[PDB]
Enzyme design. Structure first.
Site, PDB file in Angstrom:
ATOM      1  N   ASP A  63     -28.050  96.984  79.984  1.00  0.00           N
ATOM      2  CA  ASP A  63     -27.648  98.111  80.786  1.00  0.00           C
ATOM      3  C   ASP A  63     -28.640  98.339  81.928  1.00  0.00           C
ATOM      4  OD1 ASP A  63     -25.251  98.887  79.246  1.00  0.00           O
ATOM      5  OD2 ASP A  63     -26.679  99.489  77.684  1.00  0.00           O
ATOM      6  N   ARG A  71     -33.172  99.507  82.038  1.00  0.00           N
ATOM      7  CA  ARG A  71     -33.999  99.187  80.880  1.00  0.00           C
ATOM      8  C   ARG A  71     -35.288  98.512  81.278  1.00  0.00           C
ATOM      9  NH1 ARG A  71     -30.809 102.633  78.317  1.00  0.00           N
ATOM     10  NH2 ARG A  71     -28.939 101.619  77.424  1.00  0.00           N
ATOM     11  N   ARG A 131     -24.976 108.588  87.610  1.00  0.00           N
ATOM     12  CA  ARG A 131     -24.546 107.198  87.367  1.00  0.00           C
ATOM     13  C   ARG A 131     -23.260 106.866  88.116  1.00  0.00           C
ATOM     14  NH1 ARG A 131     -23.968 106.721  81.105  1.00  0.00           N
ATOM     15  NH2 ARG A 131     -23.712 104.508  81.615  1.00  0.00           N
ATOM     16  N   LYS A 161     -16.828  99.941  84.025  1.00  0.00           N
ATOM     17  CA  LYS A 161     -16.873 100.904  82.911  1.00  0.00           C
ATOM     18  C   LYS A 161     -16.816 102.340  83.449  1.00  0.00           C
ATOM     19  CE  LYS A 161     -21.925 100.977  82.267  1.00  0.00           C
ATOM     20  NZ  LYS A 161     -23.149 100.634  81.448  1.00  0.00           N
ATOM     21  N   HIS A 162     -16.392 103.320  82.652  1.00  0.00           N
ATOM     22  CA  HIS A 162     -15.966 103.183  81.254  1.00  0.00           C
ATOM     23  C   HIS A 162     -14.487 103.486  81.269  1.00  0.00           C
ATOM     24  CE1 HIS A 162     -20.123 104.565  81.509  1.00  0.00           C
ATOM     25  NE2 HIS A 162     -20.371 103.786  80.474  1.00  0.00           N
ATOM     26  N   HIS A 174     -14.970 121.131  70.349  1.00  0.00           N
ATOM     27  CA  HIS A 174     -13.519 121.306  70.392  1.00  0.00           C
ATOM     28  C   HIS A 174     -12.778 120.160  69.697  1.00  0.00           C
ATOM     29  CE1 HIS A 174      -9.494 122.038  71.747  1.00  0.00           C
ATOM     30  NE2 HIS A 174      -9.507 121.063  72.638  1.00  0.00           N
ATOM     31  N   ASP A 243     -17.012  99.399  72.844  1.00  0.00           N
ATOM     32  CA  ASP A 243     -18.174 100.256  72.976  1.00  0.00           C
ATOM     33  C   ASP A 243     -19.224  99.903  71.903  1.00  0.00           C
ATOM     34  OD1 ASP A 243     -16.589 103.313  71.479  1.00  0.00           O
ATOM     35  OD2 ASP A 243     -16.612 101.231  70.880  1.00  0.00           O
TER      36      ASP A 243
HETATM   37  C1  LIG Z   1     -20.920 106.515  78.328  1.00  0.00           C
HETATM   38  C2  LIG Z   1     -21.940 105.435  78.137  1.00  0.00           C
HETATM   39  O1  LIG Z   1     -23.049 105.538  78.649  1.00  0.00           O
HETATM   40  N1  LIG Z   1     -21.591 104.380  77.402  1.00  0.00           N
HETATM   41  C3  LIG Z   1     -22.532 103.315  77.140  1.00  0.00           C
HETATM   42  C4  LIG Z   1     -22.325 102.136  78.101  1.00  0.00           C
HETATM   43  O2  LIG Z   1     -22.530 102.492  79.451  1.00  0.00           O
HETATM   44  C5  LIG Z   1     -23.200 100.918  77.677  1.00  0.00           C
HETATM   45  O3  LIG Z   1     -22.890  99.799  78.519  1.00  0.00           O
HETATM   46  C6  LIG Z   1     -23.062 100.618  76.155  1.00  0.00           C
HETATM   47  C7  LIG Z   1     -24.005  99.512  75.676  1.00  0.00           C
HETATM   48  O4  LIG Z   1     -25.311 100.052  75.669  1.00  0.00           O
HETATM   49  O5  LIG Z   1     -23.318 101.782  75.328  1.00  0.00           O
HETATM   50  C8  LIG Z   1     -22.361 102.774  75.702  1.00  0.00           C
HETATM   51  O6  LIG Z   1     -21.010 102.759  75.264  1.00  0.00           O
END
Ligand SMILES: CC(=O)N[C@@H]1[C@@H](O)[C@H](O)[C@@H](CO)O[C@@H]1O
EC number: 3.2.1.52
Length: 330
Positions: A63, A71, A131, A161-162, A174, A243
């Protein structure tokens, strides 16, 4: 590349147990995190070791978006939040420098890909925020297309993404999964449609988000979102990632085994199990021995050193300009 499963390793160096699991044929990639990064040399050594232990081609991903999600920082060029490009007078020009630079420096350190770009719209979802490249369709398309061109230019595969859009999401009490209850998300999805149609996405990661007007499941575990919409309506031909099944996924289905099954049956080509080695092992044992030959498209198309990269005026400029841009709006 051969296998569907992405996993992680614990630290800065490969362990003996890492070297064993990397040979499991169902493994196709390693996702790296901040805790796997100490310095440039250590990173190069880690990735070299991963590729040697695997024997066969294997993907290495991270990421690396810029801003809040980068990172590898120390010893790398700092990349701005994706939001910042459109705030500059020459944003589309700078967005391409940002994408090129981010991708080039990763390739220079033997990484195949960054799980980027974010194609979500708006800044109001805490998890997304800066982001996002912008808060309307044209701004997002303009600046994300530039960033994509930069990645492409150095031979790095691209991941939208996403899907189908995390920009307007709420994660309160909720419901049990983050959600977007809008009667239509057409604008959000139009961004994804446009990039799919332009043929600029090699891969797609779905959102762990329920859109109740459309389907009961989180998009990342939804046959509707990942087959009916993503494949049939939108004609996406690339790789679909899950995910992070360790903390996201179709949580009601059960544990890692049930989440992995649901991700694959829903239409994910590849699945991610992070932070939980024993869960990765469980899934590997549960599943058939699996192959994803089309994932070979995600292996990087270029090879060069960081020394070689820095000799490019394109690097000299991009690196300096990204630092200026950060300083301009931080
Ligand atoms: C909403 C969000 O941040 N989702 C993250 C994504 O961006 C990332 O690529 C993945 C792997 O680390 O973990 C998540 O699903």
């Amino acid at each position: 590349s051969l296998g569907p499963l992405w996993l992680d390793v614990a630290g800065y160096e490969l362990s003996a147990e890492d070297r064993e699991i990397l040979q499991h044929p169902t493994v196709g990639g390693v996702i790296l995190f901040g805790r796997n990064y100490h310095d440039n040399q250590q990173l190069l050594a880690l990735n070299k070791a991963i590729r040697q232990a695997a024997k066969r081609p294997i993907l290495i991903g991270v990421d690396q978006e810029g801003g809040r999600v980068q990172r590898f920082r120390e010893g790398f060029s700092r990349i701005p939040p994706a939001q910042y490009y459109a705030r500059a007078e020459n944003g589309v020009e700078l967005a391409e420098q940002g994408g090129w630079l981010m991708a080039a420096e990763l390739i220079a350190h033997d990484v195949d890909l960054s799980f980027a770009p974010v194609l979500d719209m708006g800044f109001a979802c805490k998890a997304i925020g800066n982001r996002a490249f912008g808060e309307d369709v044209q701004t997002v398309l303009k600046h994300s297309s530039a960033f994509l061109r930069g990645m492409k230019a150095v031979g790095m595969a691209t991941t939208g993404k996403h899907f189908p859009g995390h920009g307007a999401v709420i994660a309160d009490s909720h419901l049990e999964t983050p959600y977007d209850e809008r009667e239509t998300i057409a604008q959000d999805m139009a961004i994804f449609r446009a990039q799919i149609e332009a043929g600029v996405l090699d891969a797609m990661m779905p959102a762990h988000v329920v859109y109740p007007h459309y389907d009961a499941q989180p998009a990342s575990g939804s046959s509707y979102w990942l087959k009916q919409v993503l494949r049939e309506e939108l004609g996406f031909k690339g790789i679909v990632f899950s995910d992070d099944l360790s903390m996201e996924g179709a949580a009601v289905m059960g544990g890692p085994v049930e989440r992995s099954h649901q991700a694959l049956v829903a239409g994910c080509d590849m699945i991610l199990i992070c932070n939980k080695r024993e869960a990765a092992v469980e899934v590997l044992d549960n599943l058939p021995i699996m192959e994803v030959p089309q994932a070979e498209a995600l292996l990087k198309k270029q090879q060069f050193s960081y020394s070689e990269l820095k000799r490019l005026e394109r690097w000299q400029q991009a690196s300096a300009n990204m630092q200026r841009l950060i300083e301009q709006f931080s």
